[PDB]
Design an enzyme around this catalytic site. Structure first.
Site, PDB file in Angstrom:
ATOM      1  N   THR A  41       0.825  -1.200   0.000  1.00 13.24           N
ATOM      2  CA  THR A  41       0.000   0.000   0.000  1.00 13.24           C
ATOM      3  C   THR A  41       0.863   1.256   0.000  1.00 13.24           C
ATOM      4  O   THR A  41       1.796   1.376   0.790  1.00 13.24           O
ATOM      5  CB  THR A  41      -0.945   0.034   1.218  1.00 13.24           C
ATOM      6  OG1 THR A  41      -1.761  -1.143   1.227  1.00 13.24           O
ATOM      7  CG2 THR A  41      -1.837   1.263   1.170  1.00 13.24           C
TER       8      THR A  41
ATOM      9  N   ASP B  51      -2.781   3.724  -4.082  1.00 18.10           N
ATOM     10  CA  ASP B  51      -2.816   2.627  -5.035  1.00 18.10           C
ATOM     11  C   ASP B  51      -4.076   1.790  -4.820  1.00 18.10           C
ATOM     12  O   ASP B  51      -4.813   1.970  -3.850  1.00 18.10           O
ATOM     13  CB  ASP B  51      -1.564   1.757  -4.913  1.00 18.10           C
ATOM     14  CG  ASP B  51      -1.536   0.950  -3.630  1.00 18.10           C
ATOM     15  OD1 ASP B  51      -1.677   1.549  -2.544  1.00 18.10           O
ATOM     16  OD2 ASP B  51      -1.385  -0.287  -3.708  1.00 18.10           O
TER      17      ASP B  51
ATOM     18  N   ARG C  62      -4.161  -1.842  -5.163  1.00 12.93           N
ATOM     19  CA  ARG C  62      -3.902  -3.261  -4.957  1.00 12.93           C
ATOM     20  C   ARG C  62      -4.293  -3.666  -3.541  1.00 12.93           C
ATOM     21  O   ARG C  62      -3.830  -3.068  -2.565  1.00 12.93           O
ATOM     22  CB  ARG C  62      -2.431  -3.595  -5.212  1.00 12.93           C
ATOM     23  CG  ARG C  62      -2.051  -5.011  -4.793  1.00 12.93           C
ATOM     24  CD  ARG C  62      -0.606  -5.344  -5.125  1.00 12.93           C
ATOM     25  NE  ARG C  62      -0.408  -5.566  -6.552  1.00 12.93           N
ATOM     26  CZ  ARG C  62       0.730  -5.974  -7.096  1.00 12.93           C
ATOM     27  NH1 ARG C  62       1.804  -6.204  -6.359  1.00 12.93           N
ATOM     28  NH2 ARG C  62       0.793  -6.153  -8.412  1.00 12.93           N
TER      29      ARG C  62
ATOM     30  N   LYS D 158      -9.124   2.889  -1.805  1.00 13.07           N
ATOM     31  CA  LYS D 158      -8.570   3.113  -0.478  1.00 13.07           C
ATOM     32  C   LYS D 158      -8.807   4.523   0.042  1.00 13.07           C
ATOM     33  O   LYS D 158      -8.530   4.785   1.216  1.00 13.07           O
ATOM     34  CB  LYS D 158      -7.064   2.815  -0.475  1.00 13.07           C
ATOM     35  CG  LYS D 158      -6.724   1.374  -0.817  1.00 13.07           C
ATOM     36  CD  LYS D 158      -5.227   1.129  -0.791  1.00 13.07           C
ATOM     37  CE  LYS D 158      -4.897  -0.283  -1.248  1.00 13.07           C
ATOM     38  NZ  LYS D 158      -3.429  -0.512  -1.345  1.00 13.07           N
TER      39      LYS D 158
ATOM     40  N   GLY E 246      -2.757  -0.385   8.294  1.00 16.97           N
ATOM     41  CA  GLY E 246      -2.811  -1.149   9.524  1.00 16.97           C
ATOM     42  C   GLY E 246      -3.891  -2.207   9.477  1.00 16.97           C
ATOM     43  O   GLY E 246      -4.002  -2.941   8.491  1.00 16.97           O
TER      44      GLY E 246
ATOM     45  N   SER F 288       3.568   0.470   3.137  1.00 17.55           N
ATOM     46  CA  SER F 288       4.796  -0.273   2.880  1.00 17.55           C
ATOM     47  C   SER F 288       5.623   0.344   1.760  1.00 17.55           C
ATOM     48  O   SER F 288       6.841   0.139   1.722  1.00 17.55           O
ATOM     49  CB  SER F 288       4.473  -1.731   2.551  1.00 17.55           C
ATOM     50  OG  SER F 288       3.661  -1.826   1.395  1.00 17.55           O
TER      51      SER F 288
ATOM     52  N   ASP G  64       7.626  -1.536  -4.887  1.00 20.25           N
ATOM     53  CA  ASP G  64       7.122  -2.198  -3.690  1.00 20.25           C
ATOM     54  C   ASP G  64       6.161  -3.305  -4.093  1.00 20.25           C
ATOM     55  O   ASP G  64       5.270  -3.086  -4.920  1.00 20.25           O
ATOM     56  CB  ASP G  64       6.426  -1.197  -2.758  1.00 20.25           C
ATOM     57  CG  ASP G  64       5.738  -1.864  -1.581  1.00 20.25           C
ATOM     58  OD1 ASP G  64       6.190  -2.943  -1.143  1.00 20.25           O
ATOM     59  OD2 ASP G  64       4.733  -1.307  -1.094  1.00 20.25           O
TER      60      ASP G  64
ATOM     61  N   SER H  75       2.163  -2.688  -3.529  1.00 19.21           N
ATOM     62  CA  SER H  75       1.391  -1.835  -4.422  1.00 19.21           C
ATOM     63  C   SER H  75       1.472  -2.379  -5.845  1.00 19.21           C
ATOM     64  O   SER H  75       2.065  -3.431  -6.096  1.00 19.21           O
ATOM     65  CB  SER H  75       1.903  -0.394  -4.355  1.00 19.21           C
ATOM     66  OG  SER H  75       2.198  -0.015  -3.023  1.00 19.21           O
TER      67      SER H  75
END
Lengths: 193, 248, 240, 240, 191, 205, 209, 237, 142
Positions: G18, G34, G36, G50, G64, G146, G183, G186
């Protein structure tokens, strides 16, 4: 503590070991792990120390209160549902305790026998046969059980199961008390297993 | 231990009537007139903003949005209505929005308000509320609805109704002027005509309060980007719009 | 006369009225004092008549104008004990609003809160209403100059200008005439001193009597603070 | 009266509590109930108001309620309060059985019911039960009949034969004339016949307005049918 | 005989239809799929929690129908399930629930899945619940195709269940529900 | 103290001088080795001329500071401008009564017409100490000697500014949890003055 | 009442046996994320929204425990709506920040929600970061998740005071794209929300695909 | 009586409870409701107290469903009745959850009657000014018809009426009811009793509420205004 | 001046600590049937293995209210907390609705929660003794 139960075509047979606590030698002749919930519904219980007896006596008191209040007898299904609810409630705020109950009854509205098993977490399963406390009787039950078996054939299967249990236990296993619930009520097989 | 209880403030009379509820109804009958008319594609709620000449009319509003699709008006005691409106707005979220993710339908919110009002008659600490409420709304499975709630907590649905000082004459006019094919604009015109006979002094956009439950208003949503997000259906007409409708 | 249990508690009479509320309204005029509130372009002015007939009193301790918060001022019509009770309650309410919501409490919101408390008093059998009338003034950061009034009935509303007291009708009529002449809802002045002078002159004309520096109290709310003028400030304002 | 009868906690100048007497007056308006114990049984008889033409009789509650397999209870007074009392008594019986493994005695249950009735007279915000009760049975592992009477004030007593309710004075006089404590009815039939004859002194229609219940040792409770009561009535009339 | 914890639930969407299927222990009564008029819920995990959730949701849906005077829709039921699960934030049920249905007014199929504290995962293709087989998700991914007819959808979901059963045997069975706007078909698979 | 909680590895200074008091701090907030915020403002205002800096748990200190500001508004509604001692007492009571559940340390700098500028320090535990100057934070340990060699009573404003700038520059130089800009508030009878100094200025001292 | 503690001991017994960015620009704020959504290493959803709406002009994005984030956002949104109706005024970002901070501090970090909150109110544009234990911070540009390190690197590369709306949108999109590429958490799409002073909020679903 | 009727927890010197009697008297001011139990169903009928044509007749003031087997007819205050109806629905759902079976009718009736009795024993509470006619089916007794009043007493009936014209309606039912009656005959009898006992000139459809509990299982049917009109035409009223 | 609730643990126990469910046969022992807790719940089990946040959550609002009262006492005097407590006691004392559990509007106005919602509001929540008469007995103390 070991409990067994078989539902045959017209009745339910419940067998409970007349065991005793460890460290004290006792001479007694009674079935201390079975409470009569109603004149056509019996409950056998196994597990740890007096928590299980307290729970069984509490259930018996509640069911007797219902029977007195309504001048009527609850069906075995409703009794099992109430027991499952109370068992789930009793461990909502405490560490769970080992308990396992077999409820056997004869419904007169439907005129048929019924058998239920509830474990320590409050899982109710309707079964043709069941057992608890045994470390196999499952295969013996599977191979030699039929839905339309009479009371005598169920007693013979129970005797075979008792022999299988006793072939791998010491002589400290005094015996098993057997009771039968049918259309005439609850009776005790005073002869043998 | 005589302070652990208080005797009921509302009791039965020998004839079989609760006196405090009747007196609250009397107080309702002494209030300013408020009416509601249900049409095929909307509902109109109207009231008279009776007042001091130095008081700002826009500061005090007798029509309140309960949900984006439900509004209400009252006749009677203002502070009781204000308290009830705050409670109804809170209850719409506590009981429905935080449970089902949706705003309640009109009838259920009306039922909640009615229960709150009823509890005030089974009390030794409070007297019953002195207001009568008209609640108009729209919901997906029931369409448009209009309800009246009494101080006793009883509520009933209406095609058109009026409460307050001039309730009888307004009811007669609405009975003679209502049909099942009426449109929202026709309902607004009829509401203005009915309020014309009740207001004694100045009859303009500064002494009348009108609200409608009609079509969705995307311009009042405050954001764009989600096609499935319906705009509010409650809309309060401005003073200029009321003046324009009166002139025409 | 209430003629029943309404002689003590707030329940409905057969006519549908609450006599204890009306009697609290009557109690609001015990002090026999008039107050006026007007709005400027960027200020709000409150003026309260001061009567100290007794020579043994200390005039500096006689006041019905209170500072509720940094920006909110209050004027009370009625007995001073209930006035001080209401002042402490309003101070606590404003501070709690600031703590809970992160910004200063507006004048109208505070007026609504006090009105809700008064509604509690009107509905509860074992609580009596306070026999005072409250007038909150400020310069709100969103609405500009603001005057709001609350009464023992739990009713509150805002005003372009207001007057409260036994002689409030004449002051209100004079204000209405002036506003009809000017055709505006506020006073067209840039300094709060001019607004104070105008309000003093309006009070003098309405009451038909002359006032000295010790016969009046003046409070001024600007966008920064609400502050009360002293005797020297009022004496300076009188000379004009 | 004299202003001394408006609360439960007021003593009269002559030392009376009039609200208790008024609760007894309420009890006096209920249907008559009779309890007679013989050598080896207890019989409870009840008067029933004549059933209406369109009234369903299958599920109508009986006047004699089974508190436990060995204890029964009849009442006179307000019908709705009796349900609350009976429910509490049944709950207490089950609770005592759970707590001490032993079923209650008749005297213990009578004392519990009297305690509940006494508790409901100890507050000015509560109303006492307008019910008088007759509790009958046999102690567990015992063969001595037990009959008790309980009153709204919380007082209970033990009787060989007792009547409560409307026209209970005539039935009590009949029992006093036709009952001997040293020679009680030695059989169930004699006790039932005496109870029916006592009830016939105030019952207008006759057999269809009489209910009879018989309690024997070892938890043997029988509710006699209408045919048996009719046979008893016909035999009594023939012997008359 | 008394060990019924675990299991799998598969939900898939076709064209104007949905399918929801669960495993069953047969041989010699306890189903993990329930319905509340026209919304179907399948619960995997601890059996006592499954029974508790079914009873609670029957309670709430009955009250909802009595009050609203209409049956509850899949989206509203999804939100209700989420809030009820979140109520037990620190004592959560050990369950994985899946919801399937058809909205009456719009006719759009709907499926969703939940975590143990009510986080909603609304999927347009399929939902798999349970930990009996890790390759079940892969088989569903390899077999699923968008916009299938009810017969094709039933064949696909039945084949997925059969292959998953063959992956992990005697006494295994399946219960499959095919749901349309006005017709619901319940079938048993003994293979 | 709580697992996975934001800590305050700061550099805090408060110095009393002839005309009043000056409070200074760095502007770095870190999570382990990662810098979460390099321009954070650590000078917390609880009253118009009463300011503080916080150490320990960020959430606990923020809650305590909010309660203190509310308390001082309540006090001002009654008796006018509070003294620095009163604010320090409220801070001390809140820190001490909750020391078993909250981790908080506070440096308070105030000015008033009676006492003419005061500094109080409340370290972890909840004790209170009044000092002519105070230092706190993870970077304070490296400037204990220097400050002890360079503080004088009744310094001028510019001398105090220079002393704080030098001390905080050294603290930033040696402490990995400290960095960014240097922010100061000067509290005197004239009013409140805010100052900021950038790394390219104080790194050449 | 409230969140239940029942079956805590039972659950213990059973156990014994994320990229998100926020950017300020000269006349408003932008939030981006993002799309995902994963359940472990498995991609559960390639198009997940999101960005959540506390109020029509106050938006937020969280990380979280997902259920905690959603529940806290919805509760604060209900409180904000009620408060706005009560005061008859547009809600302020400071009020939402205060409510969130006090609610999270009440639960002593046991509610695992980490938020970026952006908004526009009559006082101006605001951007805040909120930690689970109750600490809050202000900033001109913030990152979370992340993939927050790559996004923060991009933001530190190309941020300045005088940013127009288009420049801010491009910068936020580039930061989310860097988190997408570098990352594993994402990768699918970029959702944007632009809140400008004096105008309606603009929600761009799948701004970059 | 004025010295013993201001509170609900005080007995009169004659042992009477005046507040309960006044609550009972208040029932006579409500619209008439009738319940008739036939050999194969139960019929509930009621008359609305409508005075204007602006009322939404199509969209529920006299008839409510407690659950799929049990419904009620209401005579008295509507809001108190709604409170008790919500309580009864919750109790029925609780019984279903606990025992996995439908609650018997008598248990629900007794629970509600106990609540109403308790509301006559606390000084801070006034009695509920409502009367209920319960119509239900259960596997123990079959079809059942009950009535409960403000005093907390309940009674079982074959044919019963509550409300304004209870005496005349009961007289007509006594003169006409038969044990072996059918559902359609019960419907006709209820309609004719309402028409005879009405104070209005005519018994139109918009002043009526109708409900039937029957068998195909057991089905509850709350009649719509069109069905009410059809049955009124069929009967000849 | 507490923030997190303190002194939450029990210091003494007894078999008659819960006065409302004492057995009539043995008044020194509790009545397990009327407790309706499942029949296998000794009081000692409630002294161990509790979630550490439960006590903090259960006493949070009372702690905040006590801190507010202490602040009023320090700044305004004894009369202000006395009046607040008197108003709250009067409101809570005269409310008796055995068929409802929701709080009163006036209580929410006094607590300044007119437009505030918490999880206690969203989630506000037998064979023996759950009727009106039990609530009457508990309210009247008879």
């Amino acid at each position: 503590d070991i409990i067994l139960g078989i539902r045959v075509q017209d009745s339910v047979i419940l067998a409970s070991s007349k065991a005793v606590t460890r460290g004290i030698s006792v001479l007694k002749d009674s079935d201390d792990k079975t409470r009569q919930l109603s004149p056509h519904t019996l409950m056998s219980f196994a597990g740890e120390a007096g928590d299980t007896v307290q729970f069984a006596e509490y259930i018996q008191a509640n069911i007797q209160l219902y029977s007195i209040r309504e001048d009527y007898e609850l069906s075995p299904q409703a009794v099992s549902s109430f027991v499952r609810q109370e068992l789930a409630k009793s461990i909502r705020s405490r560490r769970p305790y080992q308990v396992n109950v077999l409820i056997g009854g004869y419904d007169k509205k439907k005129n048929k026998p019924e058998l239920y098993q509830i474990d320590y977490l409050g899982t109710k399963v309707e079964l043709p046969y069941g057992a608890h406390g045994y470390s196999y009787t499952f295969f013996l039950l599977d191979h030699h059980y039929r839905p339309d078996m009479t009371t005598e054939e169920g007693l013979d299967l129970l005797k075979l199961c008792v022999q299988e249990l006793e072939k791998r236990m010491p002589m400290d296993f005094k015996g098993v008390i057997v009771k039968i619930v049918d259309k005439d009520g609850i009776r005790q097989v005073d002869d043998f297993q | 231990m005589t302070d652990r209880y208080s005797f009921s403030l509302t009791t039965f009379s020998p004839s079989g009537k609760l006196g405090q509820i009747d007196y609250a109804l009397t107080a309702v009958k002494q209030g300013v007139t408020s009416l509601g008319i249900k049409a095929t594609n909307g509902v109109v709620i109207a009231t008279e903003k009776k007042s001091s000449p130095l008081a700002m009319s826009e500061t005090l509003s007798k029509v309140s949005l309960l949900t984006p699709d439900i509004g209400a008006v009252y006749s009677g005691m203002g502070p009781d209505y204000r308290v009830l409106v705050d409670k109804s707005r809170k209850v719409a979220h506590t009981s429905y929005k935080r449970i089902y993710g949706e705003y309640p339908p009109t009838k259920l919110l009306v039922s909640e308000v009615a229960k709150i009002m009823q509890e005030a008659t089974q009390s030794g600490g409070v007297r019953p509320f002195g207001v009568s409420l008209l609640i108009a709304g729209h919901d997906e499975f029931n369409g448009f609805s209009l309800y009246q709630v009494d101080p006793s907590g009883s509520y009933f649905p209406w095609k058109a109704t009026a409460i307050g000082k001039g309730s009888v004459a307004a009811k007669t006019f609405l009975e003679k002027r209502w049909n099942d094919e009426l449109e929202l604009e026709d309902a607004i015109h009829i509401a203005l005509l009915t309020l014309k006979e009740s207001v004694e002094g100045e009859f303009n956009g500064d002494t009348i309060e009108l609200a409608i439950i009609g079509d969705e208003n995307p311009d009042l949503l405050g954001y764009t980007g989600i096609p499935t997000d319906k705009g509010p259906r409650f809309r309060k007409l401005t003073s200029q719009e009321i003046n324009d409708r009166l002139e025409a | 006369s209430a003629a029943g249990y309404d002689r003590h508690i707030t329940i409905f009479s057969p006519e549908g009225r609450l006599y204890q509320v009306e009697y609290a309204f009557k109690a609001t005029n015990q002090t026999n004092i008039n107050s006026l509130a007007v709005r400027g372009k960027d200020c709000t002015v409150v003026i309260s008549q001061k009567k100290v007939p007794d020579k043994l009193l200390d005039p500096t301790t006689v006041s019905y104008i209170f500072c509720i918060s940094r920006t909110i001022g209050m004027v009370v019509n009625g007995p001073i004990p209930d006035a001080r009770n209401a002042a402490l309650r309003a101070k606590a309410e404003a501070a709690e609003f600031r703590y809970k919501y992160g910004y200063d409490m507006p004048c109208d919101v505070l007026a609504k809160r006090m009105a809700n408390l008064s509604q509690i008093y009107t509905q509860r059998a074992y609580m009596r209403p306070l026999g005072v009338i409250l007038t909150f003034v400020s310069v709100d950061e969103e609405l500009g100059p603001s005057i709001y009034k609350t009464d023992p009935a739990g009713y509150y509303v805002g005003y372009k200008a207001t007057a409260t007291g036994p002689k409030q009708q004449e002051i209100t009529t004079n204000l209405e005439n002036h506003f009809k002449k000017s055709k505006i809802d506020h006073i067209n002045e840039e300094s709060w001193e001019k607004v104070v002078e105008f309000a003093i002159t309006h009070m003098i004309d309405a009451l038909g009597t002359e006032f000295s520096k010790n016969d009046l109290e003046v409070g001024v709310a600007t966008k920064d603070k609400f502050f009360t003028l002293s005797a020297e400030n009022i004496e300076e304002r009188l000379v004009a | 009266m004299s202003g001394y009868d408006r609360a439960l906690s007021i003593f009269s100048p002559d030392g009376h509590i009039f609200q208790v007497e008024y609760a007894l007056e309420a009890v006096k308006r209920g249907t008559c109930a009779v309890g007679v114990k013989g050598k080896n049984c207890v019989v409870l008889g009840c008067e029933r108001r004549s059933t209406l033409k369109l009234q369903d009789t299958r599920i109508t509650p009986s006047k004699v309620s089974k508190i436990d397999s060995h204890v029964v209870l009849s009442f006179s007074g307000l019908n709705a309060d009796s349900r609350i009392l009976i429910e509490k008594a049944r709950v207490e019986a089950q609770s005592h059985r759970l707590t001490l493994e032993d079923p209650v005695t008749v005297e213990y249950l009578t004392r519990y019911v009297a305690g509940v009735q006494q508790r409901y007279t100890q507050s000015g915000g509560v109303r006492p039960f307008g019910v008088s009760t007759l509790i009958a049975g046999f102690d567990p592992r015992d063969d001595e009949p037990k009959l008790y009477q309980t009153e709204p004030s919380g007082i209970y007593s033990s009787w060989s034969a007792q009547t409560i309710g409307r026209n209970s004075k005539t039935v009590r006089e009949f029992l006093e004339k036709n009952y001997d404590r040293k020679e009680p009815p030695a059989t169930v039939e004699e006790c039932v016949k005496l109870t029916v004859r006592s009830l016939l002194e105030v019952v207008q229609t006759g057999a269809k307005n009489i209910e009879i219940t018989v309690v024997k040792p070892d938890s043997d409770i029988v509710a006699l049918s209408s045919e048996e009561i009719n046979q008893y009535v016909t035999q009594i009339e023939q012997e008359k | 005989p008394s060990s019924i914890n675990g299991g799998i639930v598969v939900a898939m969407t076709g064209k104007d239809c949905v399918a929801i299927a669960c495993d069953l222990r047969l041989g010699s009564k306890f189903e993990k799929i329930f319905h509340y008029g026209h919304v179907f819920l399948g619960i995997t995990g601890l059996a006592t929690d499954v029974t508790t959730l079914n009873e609670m949701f029957r309670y709430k849906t009955n009250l909802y129908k009595l009050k609203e005077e209409r049956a509850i829709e899949p989206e509203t039921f999804t939100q209700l399930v989420s809030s009820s699960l979140y109520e037990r934030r620190f004592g959560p049920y050990f369950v994985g629930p899946v919801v399937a249905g058809i909205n009456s007014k719009s006719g759009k199929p709907f499926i969703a899945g939940f975590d143990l504290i009510g986080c909603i995962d609304e999927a347009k293709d399929f939902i798999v619940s349970g930990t009996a087989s890790d390759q079940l998700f892969g088989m569903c991914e390899s077999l699923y195709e968008p916009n299938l007819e009810p017969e094709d959808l039933f064949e696909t979901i039945s084949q997925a269940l059969l292959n998953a059963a063959d992956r992990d045997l005697s006494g295994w069975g399946a219960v499959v529900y095919i749901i349309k706007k006005d017709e619901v078909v319940k079938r048993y698979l003994k293979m | 103290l709580k697992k996975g909680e934001v800590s305050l590895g700061t550099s805090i200074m408060a110095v009393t001088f002839k005309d009043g008091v000056i409070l200074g701090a760095d502007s770095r907030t870190t999570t382990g080795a990662y810098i979460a915020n390099r321009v954070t403002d650590k000078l917390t205002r609880v009253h118009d001329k009463i300011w503080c800096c916080r150490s320990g748990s960020a959430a606990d200190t923020q809650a305590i500071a909010d309660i203190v500001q509310y308390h001082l508004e309540l006090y001002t509604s009654q008796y006018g401008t509070p003294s620095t001692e009163t604010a320090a007492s409220v801070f001390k009571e809140l820190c001490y009564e909750n020391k078993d559940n909250l981790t908080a340390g506070i440096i308070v700098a105030g000015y008033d017409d009676k006492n003419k500028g005061e500094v109080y320090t409340i370290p972890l535990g909840g004790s209170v100490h009044k000092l002519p100057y105070a230092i706190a934070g993870s970077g304070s340990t490296f400037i204990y000697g220097y400050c002890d060699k360079n503080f004088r009573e009744n310094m001028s404003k510019e001398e105090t500014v220079d002393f704080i700038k030098h001390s905080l520059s050294q603290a930033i130089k040696w402490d990995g949890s400290s960095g960014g800009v240097i922010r100061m508030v000067v509290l005197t009878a004239a009013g409140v003055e805010r100052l900021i100094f950038y790394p390219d200025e104080y790194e050449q001292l | 009442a409230g969140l239940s503690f029942d079956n805590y001991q039972r659950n213990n017994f059973l156990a014994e046996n994320t990229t998100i960015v926020g950017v300020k620009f000269n006349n408003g704020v932008v939030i981006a994320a993002d799309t995902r959504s994963t359940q472990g290493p498995i991609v559960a959803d390639k198009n997940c929204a999101k960005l959540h709406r506390i109020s029509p002009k106050i938006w937020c994005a969280g990380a979280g425990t997902a259920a905690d984030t959603e529940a806290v956002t919805q509760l604060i949104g209900s409180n904000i709506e009620l408060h706005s109706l009560y005061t008859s005024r547009e809600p302020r970002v400071v009020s939402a920040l205060q409510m969130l901070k006090q609610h999270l501090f009440k639960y002593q970090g046991h509610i695992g929600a980490y938020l970026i909150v952006a908004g526009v109110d009559p006082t101006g544009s605001h951007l805040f970061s909120i930690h689970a234990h109750g600490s809050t911070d202000v900033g001109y540009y913030l990152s979370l998740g992340s993939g927050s390190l790559a996004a923060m690197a991009v933001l530190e590369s190309h941020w300045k005071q005088d940013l127009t709306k288009e420049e801010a949108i491009k910068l936020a999109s580039d930061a989310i794209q860097a988190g997408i590429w570098n990352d594993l958490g994402s990768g699918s799409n970029v959702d944007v929300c632009v809140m400008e002073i004096g105008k309606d909020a603009e929600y761009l679903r799948n701004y970059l695909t | 009586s004025r010295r013993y009727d201001s509170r609900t927890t005080i007995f009169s010197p004659e042992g009477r409870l005046y507040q309960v009697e006044y609550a009972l008297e208040s029932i006579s001011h409500a619209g008439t409701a009738i319940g008739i139990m036939a050999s194969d169903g139960i019929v509930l009928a009621a008359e609305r107290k409508v005075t204007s044509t602006l009322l939404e007749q199509d969209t529920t003031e006299k008839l409510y469903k407690l659950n799929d087997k049990i419904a009620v007819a209401v005579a008295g205050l509507t809001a108190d009745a709604e409170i008790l109806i919500n309580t009864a629905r919750i109790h029925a759902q609780n019984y279903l959850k606990t025992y996995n079976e439908d609650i018997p009718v008598e248990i629900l009736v007794r629970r509600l009657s106990d609540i109403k009795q308790g509301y006559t024993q606390h000084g801070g509470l006034r009695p509920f000014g409502v009367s209920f006619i319960y119509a239900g089916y259960d596997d123990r007794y079959g079809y059942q018809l009950y009535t409960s009043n403000p005093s907390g007493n309940y009674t079982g009936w074959k044919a019963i009426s509550v409300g304004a014209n209870t005496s005349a309606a009961q007289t007509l039912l006594q003169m006409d009811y038969k044990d072996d009656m059918k559902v359609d005959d019960a419907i006709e009898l209820a309609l004719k009793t309402l028409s005879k006992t009405t104070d209005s000139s005519a018994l139109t459809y918009d002043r009526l509420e109708f409900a039937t509990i029957r068998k195909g299982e057991v089905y509850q049917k709350i009649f719509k205004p069109q069905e009410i009109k059809d049955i009124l035409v069929k009967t000849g009223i | 001046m507490n923030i997190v609730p303190q002194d939450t643990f029990k210091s003494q126990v007894s078999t008659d600590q819960d006065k409302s469910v004492l057995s009539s046969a043995v008044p020194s022992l509790p009545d397990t049937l009327r407790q309706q807790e499942g029949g296998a719940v000794p009081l000692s089990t409630q002294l161990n293995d509790r979630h550490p946040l439960e006590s903090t959550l259960k006493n949070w609002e009372t702690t905040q209210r006590q801190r507010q009262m202490e602040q009023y006492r320090q700044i305004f005097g004894i009369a202000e907390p006395m009046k607040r407590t008197m108003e709250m006691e009067i409101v809570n004392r005269t409310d008796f609705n055995p068929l409802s559990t929701n709080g009163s509007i006036h209580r929410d106005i006094l607590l300044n929660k007119e437009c505030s919602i918490d999880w206690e509001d969203v989630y506000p929540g037998t064979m023996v003794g759950d009727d009106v008469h039990s609530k009457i007995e508990k309210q009247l103390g008879i």
